[PDB]
Amino acid sequence: GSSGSSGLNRDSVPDNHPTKFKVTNVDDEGVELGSGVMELTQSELVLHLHRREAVRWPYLCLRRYGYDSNLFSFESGRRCQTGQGIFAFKCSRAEEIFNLLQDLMQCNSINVMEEPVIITRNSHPAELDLPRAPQPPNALGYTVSS
């Protein structure tokens, strides 16, 4: 829970922004490959980088989201732009993003904003993911006669 809006223009995003957090995509070893900025908006997680193309990650797919000392990563399926694979990044306020992530996820923002037309619309059937399913019960044997 938080609030506070002001009509002041921003010059340069700080390294301790409440909504923004400068991250550094690292490798298994932890080395620094490229710099980027992570955004935590009710909408979804979006990474910013050089002229290169950007990326986005829907809070939905996000199956697991943890944190650690100057270490933050998330697991995504194969339906996401990037695709199947994990991505970790080195930051200074990883916890902050972790404590906020569960804040936007729980809110499950329901079309909070008027979104444009999406395939979701009723149309020809196709290979679309499937929902959850219940667990199958057990069976009962029987007694033997004389």
Partner: peptide, 19 residues
């Protein structure tokens, strides 16, 4: 977007249980 083999973290608070 380096590809990792496994999650370097251990304490995670699973949120979405849907595929």
């Amino acid at each position: 977007l380096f590809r990792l083999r496994h999650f370097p973290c251990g304490n995670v608070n699973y949120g979405y249980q849907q595929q």
